[PDB]
């Protein structure tokens, strides 16, 4: 980012870096060593929440925060729709597509979930709601490669209507199912994609015409998570959960684009706190959380998963956290919805409306 910052230096920077990050692949063994140790993988995708949006209601100290081994502070959601947000998700084993290629076949080794599957661990599909909404469902499946039945959501709480209508299911029984569900399913590995709305501005009671409160669906969220991890600590189950936000909610807005809009694919939008934490360990992580300060995305978590795939972190006595959370992918801070693009340039966030001349995105 030498260059002077004119459109059609800004466009070369971002074709460049689509051209790298073609070449970039989270690489997967051919099988599992033969003393590997199985545990179950847990990824939970929430819409509607940023770093942001945490400071706005007042969150900043839940102890959710701090119940974490590892935490990103610079990732990158890349999009600021759910679906995209998803898709680049599936994706993960795969450098960083522009949002016209979210819409076209990518490589089969581009999906961590089937990367995981290959290698015997037992793949889960769970949702929190119908994803009928927006074509959500339909997205994950044909565009996140996502193939699964869904796991089964009968006589689940129903905490909210989804704005559509359709049932919000309350996070505390879908997790709860989801220890049973993996109990019951016949293998010690396996693999969970669970995406959750619980925070959407849409959800309502039916009836009632109350603005919701987010700072206390919040509260309510992070209260039911942080007890899930607890439980799950004194199960002795090995672990690996990661959380990832789709995008923020907006809900403080900016000279350019007003709070609750989201078609710009703003900074404060898709700066997501991803949190990392393992259970069942040998010898659990001890400290605050270790942070990863440098700009991440979707790559970081596939090469932190292929770190961890043989199992042996929880057995080892004396873990080498440093190895571990050291030299991850890097990816810079690009986001993309349908007709928006916003990078950083030289520091500098500028945007790209559509596909016009870079502006500087005002502060
Ligand atoms: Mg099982
Ligand atoms: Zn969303």
Redesign the pocket.
């Known amino acids: 980012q030498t260059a002077p910052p004119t459109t059609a230096n800004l466009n070369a920077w971002l074709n460049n870096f689509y051209n790298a990050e073609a070449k970039r692949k989270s690489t997967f063994p051919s099988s599992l060593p033969a003393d590997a140790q199985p545990f179950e993988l847990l990824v939970i995708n929430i819409?509607?929440l940023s770093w942001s949006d945490i400071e706005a209601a007042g969150l900043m100290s839940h102890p959710l925060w701090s119940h974490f081994d590892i935490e990103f502070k610079n990732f990158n959601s890349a999009t600021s729709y759910?679906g995209p947000?998803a898709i680049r998700l599936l994706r993960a084993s795969c450098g960083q597509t522009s949002h016209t290629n979210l819409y076209q076949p990518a490589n089969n080794d581009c999906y961590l979930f089937d990367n995981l599957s290959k290698l015997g661990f037992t793949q889960h599909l769970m949702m929190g709601h119908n994803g009928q909404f927006g074509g959500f469902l339909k997205e994950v499946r044909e565009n996140g490669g996502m193939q699964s039945e869904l796991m089964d959501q009968t006589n689940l709480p129903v905490i909210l209507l989804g704005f559509d209508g359709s049932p919000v299911y309350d996070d505390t029984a879908v997790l709860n199912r989801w220890l049973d569900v993996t109990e019951k399913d016949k293998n010690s590995r396996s693999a969970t994609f669970y995406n959750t709305?619980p925070l959407?501005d849409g959800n309502h009671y039916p009836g009632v015409s109350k603005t919701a409160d987010y700072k206390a669906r919040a509260q309510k969220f992070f209260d039911e998570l942080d007890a899930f991890f607890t439980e799950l600590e004194k199960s002795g189950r090995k672990v690996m959960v990661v959380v990832v936000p789709?995008?923020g909610g907006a809900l403080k807005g900016d000279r350019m684009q007003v709070s609750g809009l989201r078609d710009i694919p703003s900074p404060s939008i898709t700066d997501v706190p991803v949190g990392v934490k393992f259970f069942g360990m040998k010898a659990p992580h001890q400290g605050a959380p270790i942070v990863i300060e440098q700009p991440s995305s979707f790559l970081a978590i596939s090469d932190l998963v292929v770190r961890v795939l043989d199992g042996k972190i929880f057995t080892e006595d004396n873990v080498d956290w440093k190895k571990l959370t050291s030299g991850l992918p890097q990816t810079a801070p690009v986001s993309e919805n349908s007709n928006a693009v916003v990078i950083q340039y030289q520091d500098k966030p500028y945007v790209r409306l559509n596909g016009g001349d870079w502006v500087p995105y005002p502060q």
């Open positions: 819409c509607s759910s947000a709305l959407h789709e995008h």
